[PDB]
Ligand SMILES: Cc1cc2nc3c(=O)[nH]c(=O)nc-3n(C[C@H](O)[C@H](O)[C@H](O)COP(=O)(O)O)c2cc1C
Ligand SMILES: Cc1cc2nc3c(=O)[nH]c(=O)nc-3n(C[C@H](O)[C@H](O)[C@H](O)COP(=O)(O)O)c2cc1C
Ligand SMILES: O=C(O)c1cccnc1
């Protein structure tokens with residue numbers, strides 16, 4: 383709730399990508415539930431929350447991923463928890479998906495038509511998202527990277543290590559998960575994944591570009 | 602550095618999108634540098650770190666933004682600080698950008714050709730990023746939304762309010778900032794923005810989907 387600049391900086395400095403997990407250690411259900419809340423409570427463009435969190439504790443499913451998940455093949459067997467994040471497909475301003483968005487905010491027929499023209503201008507004019515399906519999906523997939531970032535940070539504040547994962551064949555992971563009946567492949571598609579647990583090895587040297595190279599002040 | 606579940610949960614409940622800032626309150630330079638570090642230290646796919654943070658404190662430049670920034674119109678006049686986050690364009694596995702990435706990790710000719718083979722498979726086969734410029738750019742822009750999320754959360758743990766911003770004409774924001782010579786428009790393009798300051802109104806309550814609607818457990 384309140385931290386000092388030296389605790390805040392250390393909290394973001396201390397989080398590291400953990401590629402080797404201790405299979406003997408596992409996260410508590412209350413610890414992981416608060417990690418998932420970090421995700422659920424994340425902000426998202428126009429309150430869209432275009433995400434779904436699949437928690438893959440089934441061990442037969444983890445083994446089936448191994449062949450096309452080179453980024454986490456040596457993490458799938460030992461991590462305590464695995465999360466695959468999906469992003470909403472085709473979240474157009476006039477889609478049922480956005481009727482639910484407006485409905486969660488209690489919008490009358492007039493409030494909805496004003497919000498609808500705002501969504502349209504955002505998607506069609508401001509960001510040019512309705513050229514094809516991939517650009518619109520990537521917009522919701524961007525929001526899911528917000529939830530991903532917050533789950534990593536919330537985990538690291540609870541002493542739990544993590545690794546974000548993109549190292550897998552999207553097409554094969556999509557098919558494997560949709561054929562296992564875990565989501566409707568016309569409404570959602572995989573966006574990014576993440577492992578959680580406790581490090582087995584040591585945490586390496588934090589390496590990033592300098593602050594003076596990545597910031598330009600405009601005064 | 603270490604928080605309890607009540608503190609972590611409260612940290613993500615307390616962060617809210619602030620549309621109304623107190624113009625008499627400014628964030629100190631030391632507080633704002635610690636917010637910028639939160640972004641700099643964020644994880645990124647293959648350590649790409651594909652972001653640049655523009656801090657727009659010039660009030661003439663802010664005023665030039667108001668006509669096409671409906672999402673931020675009143676925030677531009679009262680927020681303490683404004684950050685426009687750029688994402689790298691054309692970040693192909695065989696680009697100079699990725700020679701810099703490999704160079705910061707110190708790889709020899711053998712390690713660079715092995716890593717280049719992994720970047721190739723990741724970008725071309727696994728994620729299908731190389732079918733046009735937009736898909737490759739949107740990959741880096743997803744990374745920058747991680748940096749965005751960490752800046753919002755790091756700011757709120759310091760007691761500083763914020764609001765992520767997508768509500769603006771992107772084409773016109775790219776042009777306006779490139780005409781001030783702030784980046785090379787063939788190397789970078791605007792990804793997302795954020796305002797920071799101290800709110801003038803109180804936090805309204807979280808409205809999110811339930812944990813039971815957005816989490817699917819597979820045991
Ligand atoms: C990427 C992104 C862009 C956003 N753009 C704007 C914006 O332009 N203007 C605005 O007022 N709010 C914007 N929001 C704020 C969201 O509406 C807000 O996150 C959501 O309604 C949830 O509220 P909370 O953030 O207050 O929890 C944006 C949020 C995100 C994540
Ligand atoms: C979106 C995303 C995907 C990532 N994918 C993988 C991955 O598949 N496998 C992996 O080992 N690390 C992956 N990483 C970890 C990064 O390589 C790591 O974050 C970065 O190099 C910085 O190191 P640090 O996080 O330990 O500081 C990923 C990171 C991000 C952000
Ligand atoms: O998220 C919002 O509420 C929002 C986004 C863009 C423009 N106006 C509002």
Ligand SMILES: O=C(O)c1cccnc1
Nearest residue numbers: 453548549645646647648
């Ligand atoms: O970020 C990495 O280190 C990474 C990303 C994808 C696949 N393997 C490694």
